[PDB]
Design an enzyme around this catalytic site. Sequence first.
Site, PDB file in Angstrom:
ATOM      1  N   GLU C 117     160.441  29.693  53.885  1.00  0.00           N
ATOM      2  CA  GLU C 117     159.153  29.902  53.239  1.00  0.00           C
ATOM      3  C   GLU C 117     159.049  31.326  52.713  1.00  0.00           C
ATOM      4  OE1 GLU C 117     156.137  29.165  56.073  1.00  0.00           O
ATOM      5  OE2 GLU C 117     156.334  26.983  56.072  1.00  0.00           O
ATOM      6  N   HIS C 695     128.452  37.251  32.621  1.00  0.00           N
ATOM      7  CA  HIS C 695     129.392  38.298  32.261  1.00  0.00           C
ATOM      8  C   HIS C 695     130.766  38.015  32.845  1.00  0.00           C
ATOM      9  CE1 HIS C 695     126.263  41.627  31.220  1.00  0.00           C
ATOM     10  NE2 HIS C 695     126.196  40.574  30.431  1.00  0.00           N
ATOM     11  N   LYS C 715     123.409  54.308  49.319  1.00  0.00           N
ATOM     12  CA  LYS C 715     122.300  54.933  50.032  1.00  0.00           C
ATOM     13  C   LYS C 715     122.751  56.069  50.944  1.00  0.00           C
ATOM     14  CE  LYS C 715     119.328  50.876  49.803  1.00  0.00           C
ATOM     15  NZ  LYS C 715     118.631  49.776  50.519  1.00  0.00           N
ATOM     16  N   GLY C 718     123.455  59.466  49.027  1.00  0.00           N
ATOM     17  CA  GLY C 718     122.391  60.257  48.450  1.00  0.00           C
ATOM     18  C   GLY C 718     121.912  59.777  47.105  1.00  0.00           C
TER      19      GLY C 718
HETATM   20  N1  LIG Z   1     155.193  19.845  49.823  1.00  0.00           N
HETATM   21  C1  LIG Z   1     155.264  20.161  51.139  1.00  0.00           C
HETATM   22  N2  LIG Z   1     156.279  19.722  51.910  1.00  0.00           N
HETATM   23  C2  LIG Z   1     156.359  20.026  53.215  1.00  0.00           C
HETATM   24  N3  LIG Z   1     155.454  20.774  53.862  1.00  0.00           N
HETATM   25  C3  LIG Z   1     154.384  21.277  53.209  1.00  0.00           C
HETATM   26  C4  LIG Z   1     154.224  20.990  51.780  1.00  0.00           C
HETATM   27  N4  LIG Z   1     153.097  21.606  51.388  1.00  0.00           N
HETATM   28  C5  LIG Z   1     152.577  22.230  52.473  1.00  0.00           C
HETATM   29  N5  LIG Z   1     153.350  22.037  53.555  1.00  0.00           N
HETATM   30  C6  LIG Z   1     153.090  22.559  54.917  1.00  0.00           C
HETATM   31  O1  LIG Z   1     151.798  23.168  54.979  1.00  0.00           O
HETATM   32  C7  LIG Z   1     151.840  24.313  55.831  1.00  0.00           C
HETATM   33  C8  LIG Z   1     150.976  25.429  55.270  1.00  0.00           C
HETATM   34  O2  LIG Z   1     149.676  24.957  54.930  1.00  0.00           O
HETATM   35  P1  LIG Z   1     149.102  25.382  53.491  1.00  0.00           P
HETATM   36  O3  LIG Z   1     148.998  24.141  52.636  1.00  0.00           O
HETATM   37  O4  LIG Z   1     149.935  26.566  53.057  1.00  0.00           O
HETATM   38  O5  LIG Z   1     147.616  25.927  53.777  1.00  0.00           O
HETATM   39  P2  LIG Z   1     146.710  26.477  52.563  1.00  0.00           P
HETATM   40  O6  LIG Z   1     145.588  25.482  52.459  1.00  0.00           O
HETATM   41  O7  LIG Z   1     146.310  27.859  53.012  1.00  0.00           O
HETATM   42  O8  LIG Z   1     147.608  26.469  51.353  1.00  0.00           O
HETATM   43  C9  LIG Z   1     153.294  24.750  55.909  1.00  0.00           C
HETATM   44  O9  LIG Z   1     153.670  24.930  57.276  1.00  0.00           O
HETATM   45  C10 LIG Z   1     154.100  23.632  55.279  1.00  0.00           C
HETATM   46  O10 LIG Z   1     155.034  23.101  56.222  1.00  0.00           O
HETATM   47  O1  LIG Z   2     117.932  39.116  25.029  1.00  0.00           O
HETATM   48  C1  LIG Z   2     118.492  39.811  25.908  1.00  0.00           C
HETATM   49  O2  LIG Z   2     117.867  40.147  26.945  1.00  0.00           O
HETATM   50  C2  LIG Z   2     119.934  40.257  25.714  1.00  0.00           C
HETATM   51  C3  LIG Z   2     120.557  39.833  24.385  1.00  0.00           C
HETATM   52  O3  LIG Z   2     119.974  38.636  23.965  1.00  0.00           O
HETATM   53  C4  LIG Z   2     122.062  39.646  24.530  1.00  0.00           C
HETATM   54  C5  LIG Z   2     122.738  40.565  25.542  1.00  0.00           C
HETATM   55  O4  LIG Z   2     122.789  41.727  25.331  1.00  0.00           O
HETATM   56  O5  LIG Z   2     123.317  40.031  26.698  1.00  0.00           O
HETATM   57  P1  LIG Z   2     123.365  40.900  28.097  1.00  0.00           P
HETATM   58  O6  LIG Z   2     122.222  41.866  28.183  1.00  0.00           O
HETATM   59  O7  LIG Z   2     123.231  39.976  29.262  1.00  0.00           O
HETATM   60  O8  LIG Z   2     124.681  41.611  28.233  1.00  0.00           O
HETATM   61  C6  LIG Z   2     120.338  40.894  23.317  1.00  0.00           C
HETATM   62  O9  LIG Z   2     120.228  40.540  22.117  1.00  0.00           O
HETATM   63  O10 LIG Z   2     120.278  42.109  23.629  1.00  0.00           O
END
Ligand SMILES: Nc1ncnc2c1ncn2[C@@H]1O[C@H](COP(=O)(O)OP(=O)(O)O)[C@@H](O)[C@H]1O
Ligand SMILES: O=C(O)C[C@](O)(CC(=O)OP(=O)(O)O)C(=O)O
Lengths: 279, 279, 1034, 279
Positions: C117, C695, C715, C718
């Site tokens: 792994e 954004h 805060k 300052g």
């Molecule tokens: N395709 C696969 N074949 C065999 N084992 C797998 C496979 N995919 C995941 N595992 C097992 O899953 C375990 C790890 O879990 P994982 O899926 O990595 O958790 P996470 O949800 O964090 O990704 C490993 O120990 C591995 O043996």
């Molecule tokens: O109308 C408003 O308040 C904001 C906006 O429409 C567009 C804008 O700037 O998006 P933002 O401020 O989120 O980055 C404008 O014409 O100034």
Amino acid sequence: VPMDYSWARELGLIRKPASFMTSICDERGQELIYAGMPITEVFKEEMGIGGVLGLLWFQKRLPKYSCQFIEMCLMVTADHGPAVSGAHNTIICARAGKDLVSSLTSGLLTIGDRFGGALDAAAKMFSKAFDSGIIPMEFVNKMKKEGKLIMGIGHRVKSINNPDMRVQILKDYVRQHFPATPLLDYALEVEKITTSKKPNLILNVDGLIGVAFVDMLRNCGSFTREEADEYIDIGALNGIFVLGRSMGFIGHYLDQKRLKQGLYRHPWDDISYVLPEHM
Amino acid sequence: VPMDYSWARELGLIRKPASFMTSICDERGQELIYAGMPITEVFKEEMGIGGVLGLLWFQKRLPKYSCQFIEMCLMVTADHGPAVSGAHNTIICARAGKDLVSSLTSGLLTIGDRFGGALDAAAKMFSKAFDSGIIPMEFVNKMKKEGKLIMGIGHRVKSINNPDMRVQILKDYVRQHFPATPLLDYALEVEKITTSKKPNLILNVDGLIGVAFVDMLRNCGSFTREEADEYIDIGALNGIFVLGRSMGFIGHYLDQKRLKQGLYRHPWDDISYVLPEHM
Amino acid sequence: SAKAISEQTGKELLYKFICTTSAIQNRFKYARVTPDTDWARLLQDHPWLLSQNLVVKPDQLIKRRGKLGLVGVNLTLDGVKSWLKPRLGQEATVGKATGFLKNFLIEPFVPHSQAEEFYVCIYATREGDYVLFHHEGGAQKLLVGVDEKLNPEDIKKHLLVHAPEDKKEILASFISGLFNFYEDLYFTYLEINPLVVTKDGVYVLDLAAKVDATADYICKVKWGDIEFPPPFGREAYPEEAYIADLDAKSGASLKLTLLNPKGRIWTMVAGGGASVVYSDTICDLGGVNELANYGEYSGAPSEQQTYDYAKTILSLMTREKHPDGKILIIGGSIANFTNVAATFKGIVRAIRDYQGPLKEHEVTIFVRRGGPNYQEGLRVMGEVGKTTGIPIHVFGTETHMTAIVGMALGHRPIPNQPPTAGKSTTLFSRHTKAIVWGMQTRAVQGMLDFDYVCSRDEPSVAAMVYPFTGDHKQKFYWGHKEILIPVFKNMADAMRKHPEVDVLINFASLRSAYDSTMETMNYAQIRTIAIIAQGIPEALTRKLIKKADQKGVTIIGPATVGGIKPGCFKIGNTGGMLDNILASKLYRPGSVAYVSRSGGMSNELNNIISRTTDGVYEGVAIGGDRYPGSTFMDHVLRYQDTPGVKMIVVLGEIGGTEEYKICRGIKEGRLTKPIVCWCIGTCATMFSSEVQFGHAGACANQASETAVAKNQALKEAGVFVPRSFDELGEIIQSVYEDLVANGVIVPAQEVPPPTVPMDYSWARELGLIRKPASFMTSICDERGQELIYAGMPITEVFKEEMGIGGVLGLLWFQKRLPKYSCQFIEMCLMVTADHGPAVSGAHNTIICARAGKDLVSSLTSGLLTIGDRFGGALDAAAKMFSKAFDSGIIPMEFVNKMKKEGKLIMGIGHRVKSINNPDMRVQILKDYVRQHFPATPLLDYALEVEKITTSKKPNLILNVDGLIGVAFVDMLRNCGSFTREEADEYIDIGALNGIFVLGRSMGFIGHYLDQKRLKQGLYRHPWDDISYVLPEHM
Amino acid sequence: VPMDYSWARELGLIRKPASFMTSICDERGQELIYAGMPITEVFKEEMGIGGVLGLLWFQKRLPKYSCQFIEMCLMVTADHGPAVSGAHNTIICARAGKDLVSSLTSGLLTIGDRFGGALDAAAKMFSKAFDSGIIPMEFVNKMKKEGKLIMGIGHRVKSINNPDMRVQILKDYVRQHFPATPLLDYALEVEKITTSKKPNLILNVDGLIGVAFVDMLRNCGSFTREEADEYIDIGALNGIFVLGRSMGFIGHYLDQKRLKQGLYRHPWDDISYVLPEHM
Ligand SMILES: Nc1ncnc2c1ncn2[C@@H]1O[C@H](COP(=O)(O)OP(=O)(O)O)[C@@H](O)[C@H]1O
Ligand SMILES: O=C(O)C[C@](O)(CC(=O)OP(=O)(O)O)C(=O)O
Ligand SMILES: CC(C)(COP(=O)(O)OP(=O)(O)OC[C@H]1O[C@@H](n2cnc3c(N)ncnc32)[C@H](O)[C@@H]1OP(=O)(O)O)[C@@H](O)C(=O)NCCC(=O)NCCS
């Protein structure tokens, strides 16, 4: 006395070259003919204004979905209010006591690159990227590094969860009736990228009509690919806006004669005079 | 095999009627000819732009005061700021990215009756009154009873003891140089009547050019009476404003390209939308 | 924002994308188990289940599963079936939070010992990524720098000193491969514990990991549709993921986290630091368990984005009914650039869409908000209170911030009257010039309004940089005087022409502010950079911080509003509009300098310091990111070394240990001025499981990083710390009343500022001025939610199946015409469409198209021929037959009348076609008019005139000019839409002039497009077709 | 009740952006001002049409040689007969009963690419050769390899011992009066090369006005070198042809009203109908 030219030409002693060629209309017969089709048969098979537009402009009998799409494009481009730069000029010329033809034209000549030019510009931009095959993400990236905004992308207010209703009317017609829309599907993947940047950056009505007129041309079966590319080149989508917006400009002319609006002089406080000191 | 048209026309077997006539310019030869006068002798005789305007428009070699008076009319009509209806439309078309010709034209087509029409209206009104034999008091009282304002009378700012300087510049040249001004003396007697009503009601530059161009036509010796009257009817003073104001409209185009002004959309708060309820 | 991904999601990213010369073992041997799965699907999709033993673990972001009995080690498939039956789907408790167990992972057993792994952990710090190692897994440390690589030679010297000799080459190639996998896929945490390396290869048994979720625009194709699970104890809600879907598709921030969906206190607070302050106050007043959500909206969201955020909250708080009622806190501080009018117009639209269930649940709404256009926002929020019956209590700037928490919870009454009421020290001076990156014209005008009121000689902004347009100048204001500020396509042009600029304000987006900040550090004049964008990845920000340390450049941000120095300079939108600059008196310096994490609470800090103290000397908002460009001590040291500052105010947050440097700087004697501090985020220790605030750096990874522990630690240092934020102004004041009493602070005499004129749009909107509209229109309305053609919307135009003639009745007549009138109009546009190239207008269009002109010029050149002789008989026949019909004269007395006047009848007489050889366009249209029109009295008059003229010559029939003319009059007079005085006006003003022009434009454009197809050259008329009759010598 | 906008703007209570910017003319004072010069001192200083044409277009006092050269350019481009493409269109529109403004405009809108576009094109072509400094022989050979004819070189009839006399008039003015002609001497050295191929390949009036207007711009002392380069780019020689040829187009309009010519329909045997079969 010398022989008449009309007598010499009729019985074939002389020949003179014809200095003009035409293909859209034949009118020296017993019946008016629109691109091979007579005026009576234009009305019997019920092809409309978009049907005769396919005859006069393309010399092709388009399918009834291609006719009805053309008419649908002329109603959405018909007017967009009096504040635009072309409808402004028509109103100023109508208020100066000019006739219909002078007032229409004075605003009709404002159509160009900045006003009304995004219709042809979106078609040429999206067709260049689709044919020179790059994915819609590489097209959005290509336009950014050369400092060009995508034409036909971006609406001022109508954004997303708030769709432009002229776009949804026309896009619904294109999906049911057109057999294949490859450039529309490309341009709808382009706005999936640009709506991930701003919600506003959707397909315009300028960018929808532009990329669906191309799909009307090269996917309806009447046009060969070099013919369908020729019409975008020579400006057949300029004429869709110009014939469309002329309807609202004439309606803007007739409106200022209703209201009996007087002559317009622009206010001096709206003009900034920055003349030289004495030069 | 049939014969050429050009071979049959050159050596005289056939005749064909010419469908056009012109008399202002002959260019099919060794020198350019302006109304019978070659382009070399136009420059040897030191006639200027007003001297070739007498050749192209009237087919007459005007005297040197008549050529120079025409040039003075083109400089006072050259521009009157961007607030007028034509200079507005040129600026809108220049700001819409259009070329020089489209931008010039879009404001040039506003010239007509309400904008730029008082040149030809004050000529025709004062000529009709002077030829009818009515005295200037009877002409002022006639137009009052018909509910008509005198065209070419009135200014909104410069009135009396405060003269329009474009009017005083041109009236000075007309007083010294013109051999006789019967209509100008008539129009200056109407001014002495209408300035006893309001101080503002003086001769315009619209109305002094109109009555001194009539006096230039019928009292310079080049024209007969029925021939000088034809030029007022067919619109020679319309062309004086149009050629004059084209000088400032191109300058208004070149200004908005210099300043790099973008596309203009009219504000919505300046337009009053009075659309129907659901019609 | 580092978001923890699951163990399954991290392993599948590892197995797809690691590059190890040793083969990783048990690749893709993971099987996901839910309580709603079919075991027949698992045994078919993965065939390794029967063949070997298995181990099973819950994939619920639970740490230490093996010590809670949640790991079943070395179980056969049948032993796995029996193991999960008392565990899958029911409760367990890990620490304090308690949740269900509904996601388990099957992976094969690995035969190993404790000598097999290992433990590898890679985590991100500000100065680089630490790579950890330990031999007894179940520790070596190596800092890899910011722009540094991890070479396998470096691992052997430092990490692998206790690894056995035969295992060095297999770990050092895995750890090198693991580290580049960490960098390329933008991880901020990657723990493998244990890691088993036997002779068979490398076995990744567990995997804990976090990725930087703001890097989704970079790693979209490598992550795929990556799913970030909620922490154990809280469930995943589809309304939370709807809001997280909206957040990722704009620069605005929209956060939502449901803490208790049956809770009664709901918050809709603006700002990611303002919402933390409201949640601190709710949790302080005993409303921890009843606080239903954390959420915020910031970054100037639109009206539609705020509507979608509000309608999610109002649908969530109106699911089940509370007996005491429910409380919705719509709060926020004073906004800097978030438009409060458009923001509250989206909220009231959602309240009006939810006013039904909000009455049933007894929801009382408390509103406190300041900012741009907030008087309009607080107006419409009070109108919706009375017209919907929901009790909405609306407050503003005059109210304290968290007073509406105490009024809602019942701790203080509601007052009835105030409703409806080598870094440098000196960064900015009065001579500071700045370059703004981007079209932020309201931001640049706000700085320019600040400078005029601060009595500055020159404006702050020298140039603007926008890479998507050419170089020009844009008109701004110097007070009441207009000035021009140059706009540049290139940054190099702006830096060359303006060497006096030492500040860049970077308004580029999150995917543009890295390259725009690297590019501007090539220019040594720029000593301060402000980065506004929120959502830059933490790995890209640390490269900005690294180069700023080398170049000696102060970086304020990212995710900041900037900062304000009263009297000298403000950054972008800091302090808001000039309404708030004057209210907080930010035109002259005071004695307090503040530093703050959030930028909307700086505008509250502008307000608190103005009303208790002689003002702000300099305020800086450092940004809400994990690694700001400048920290607190980058500014607290500046304020300590500034004689104009007499006391310092710090507004911290939760997460990070920045405020402990202020504690250490005092104990070493470096900071001597009085410092007042408060760290927000006190509520986060009262919640069950961890919550991620608005954004990116507001995450307490340790116990010391909590705001409760930081406020306690200041805060003993300052630092004057209040008990809460609502007594911050009490202690800012009390330190001030001591510094005035000992004579440290002498307040300067108040001088009035240079007032500016009001904006026209601001004065017009609230009705102080009136201006007459110089235009009128009736045909079309376009400043609505929908395009409108004469009262009718564009969808109802297409819904009701009116055509081109239908919209021509709307645009030209403003009338819904009948379907025969709309279709007759279209037929008139089809017969007048073209008549060949020999006519005068089609000639002129061809000559202009053959001269190489555009479509618009060529159409126009032939369109201008339409008039009286070409195309004029359409309107002339209508006016002439109507004048004859209205005068009562019979068709014989009209034929005789125009014979004596020397007038040919307009619309009578065709050159070739005759009676018994009929014009077909006339016969098509006359048959439509006779069958479909109700009455045609002028057509019947014009056909009796035609009976007389065809008895003179058979040739003299009705034209198509004279048929359309007399039948369009019958269309206007007899369709029922028009009165006679109105129908006569349309013929008078030229409606049939427009019918020919709109019809013949269709064939003129066809004549333009035809000469471009044929590629016809320039036309030049023959000299023998012209008869030159020039004068002899005149 | 709300305050007036005009009152609140007067005592400085509000501010409103000027949406327009102008530099060429100031009509709103006691005198009309052309780019800093009042209309009275324009006539005192004896600066002519070309004098006010430098004020309105360039905002500069040109020297009297630059004013008089500008006038001679308008005199030689005034007309070139009725058979050119713009004078044709003006005649067709005048014979169709239209007014002066519509008839001028219908032929004015032909100008720019192949009719009258060679004036701005010869300036831009010869400047680009002169600036990117290559010898005249390496410019003649450079255009040959690109398959481009030199704009402003070549006349259909005129050639050596038989010169174009409009070219000879303007070349003697530029040689006597201009202080330095660097691009005219370059274009007259390109002319020595192309005349050794065909004698007819000489400097046009479209080619000498183009290269001597650039020499007027960048060698008269009024213009910075970057200023003079902008006027060529934004089309100052497009306006020289259009303002010049408007004298002949209005003269062509007034001629067809004098002759009282009827409506023109093109003959059917001069048109070649090549319509599709039934498409
Ligand atoms: N395709 C696969 N074949 C065999 N084992 C797998 C496979 N995919 C995941 N595992 C097992 O899953 C375990 C790890 O879990 P994982 O899926 O990595 O958790 P996470 O949800 O964090 O990704 C490993 O120990 C591995 O043996
Ligand atoms: O109308 C408003 O308040 C904001 C906006 O429409 C567009 C804008 O700037 O998006 P933002 O401020 O989120 O980055 C404008 O014409 O100034
Ligand atoms: C960063 C901020 C100032 C600018 O953001 P923005 O307006 O969304 O961004 P932009 O206008 O630059 O455009 C977004 C993208 O749209 C692109 N775009 C715009 N119009 C386009 C068009 N017609 N075609 C194609 N692309 C287009 C831009 O090129 C830009 O590209 P990029 O993002 O790849 O660079 C703003 O987003 C913001 O407020 N961010 C949050 C601020 C914040 O919260 N900071 C802390 C506050 S206290």
